[PDB]
């Protein structure tokens, strides 16, 4: 009866940091994914299940729309079978992922002069995430034998680091906003 609310998740005013990525559930709606496809404003529109053009031609039980900010350098890791700080400790797609990964510059919005330190990523982790896991804990990383006692110092590290997003950054070091649509009754087109 009414359109899927994709402007809420794509056009939203702020995005999550990748370690605490947001996920929007989407049911009881109908939308064409071609207000998306023919936008021509996307740096990545890497799809896995289906072809991007023929997408509003099909129905699924549920669809999720995950959204975060990473470095464009790093959009490489938002795809099944990747490894790296981000695919391992921040956001991991499963090997049998069916959906699309969408990205675009954000240097206008998410870049502050002198550095927008709001956006973070998980740098330390004893073992890397399972598919679609979210770990927002902030306990001091124990790299030594000495216990950390919650105090940051040598071999006792804060697991999150802050992007120094600056407008003068090369495009690899620029903010990119990313939306991951995954598909598995109630969505159609």
């Amino acid at each position: 009866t009414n359109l899927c609310p994709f402007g809420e998740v794509f056009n939203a005013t702020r995005f999550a940091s990748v370690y605490a990525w947001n996920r929007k559930r989407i049911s009881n709606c109908v939308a064409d994914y071609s207000v998306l496809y023919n936008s021509a404003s996307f740096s990545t529109f890497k799809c896995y299940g289906v072809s991007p053009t023929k997408l509003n031609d099909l129905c699924f039980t549920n669809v999720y729309a995950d959204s975060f900010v990473i470095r464009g350098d790093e959009v490489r890791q938002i795809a099944p079978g990747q490894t790296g700080k981000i695919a391992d400790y921040n956001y991991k797609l499963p090997d049998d992922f069916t959906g699309c990964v969408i990205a675009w510059n954000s240097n206008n919005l998410d870049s502050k002069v002198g550095g927008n330190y709001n956006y973070l990523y998980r740098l330390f982790r004893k073992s890397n995430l399972k598919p679609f896991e979210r770990d927002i804990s902030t306990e001091i990383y124990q790299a030594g034998s000495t216990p950390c006692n919650g105090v940051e110092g040598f071999n006792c590290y804060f697991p999150l680091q802050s992007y120094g997003f600056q407008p003068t950054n090369g495009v690899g070091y620029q903010p990119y906003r990313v939306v991951v649509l995954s598909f598995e009754a109630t969505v159609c087109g």
């Epitope: 391992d88 073992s127 990383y141 090369g170 070091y173």
Partner: antibody
């Protein structure tokens, strides 16, 4: 408080070797580690890295021939060197990466690849 | 496959001078260059990491700056224990690279 390397020596071209780097305050299984080599009187060459989560990466120069691994039970980082060539001769250093910054370095062992 | 090019190869300066090593990246590396000192026969010392930050325990005469491609490492007051080869090291792109190396000789 230190990284103690061993296992380097003389190996036949095409031979095999495994280096050891045993640690004293760091925990290899919880920490970032990379192997860096230096052929005699030449520059440095980063070779391999292992992440806290276990993900491994190699320089194309040694990929498929070398393999980085660790044993928590002995707190030791290894570098297996298979199919050795002459240009693999040099000093091999292990380093603790502070997540991509190699801050503490081992003193090195000499892998000499000659007939 | 980012190529780091330092200069000079060889450098001769007398005690207390101001010594300056530059290192330029082929592509963009942001602040993810860091600077090493390798005394003859020992392993390298990390001096400055993240392009500009002084590693815990290092003398204040060592300093470096730069972001993107052009980087500068500077010794403010040359000392006798500073003979070594100094290397810049790119670390954020996969194939990690070093510069050529700068052989520093004390003049006397």
């Amino acid at each position: 408080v230190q990284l103690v390397e061993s296992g380097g020596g003389l190996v036949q071209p095409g031979g095999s070797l495994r280096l050891s780097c045993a640690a004293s305050e760091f925990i290899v299984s919880r920490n970032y580690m990379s192997w860096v080599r230096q052929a005699p009187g030449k520059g440095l060459e980063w070779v391999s890295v292992i992440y806290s989560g276990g993900s491994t990466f190699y320089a194309d120069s040694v990929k498929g021939r070398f393999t980085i691994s660790r044993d928590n039970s002995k707190n030791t980082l290894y570098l297996q060197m298979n199919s050795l060539r002459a240009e693999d001769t040099g000093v091999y250093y292990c380093a603790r990466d502070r997540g991509l910054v190699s801050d503490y370095w081992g003193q090195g062992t000499l892998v000499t690849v000659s007939s | 496959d980012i190529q780091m090019t330092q200069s000079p190869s060889s450098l001769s300066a007398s005690v207390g001078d101001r010594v300056t090593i530059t290192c330029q990246a082929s592509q963009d590396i942001n602040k993810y260059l860091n600077w090493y000192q390798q005394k003859p026969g020992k392993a390298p010392k990390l001096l400055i990491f993240d392009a500009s930050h002084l590693e815990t325990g290092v003398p204040s005469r060592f300093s470096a700056s730069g972001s993107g491609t052009d980087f500068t490492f500077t010794i403010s007051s040359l000392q006798p224990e500073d003979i070594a080869t100094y290397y810049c090291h790119q670390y954020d792109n996969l194939p990690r690279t070093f510069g050529q190396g700068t052989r520093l000789e004390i003049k006397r």
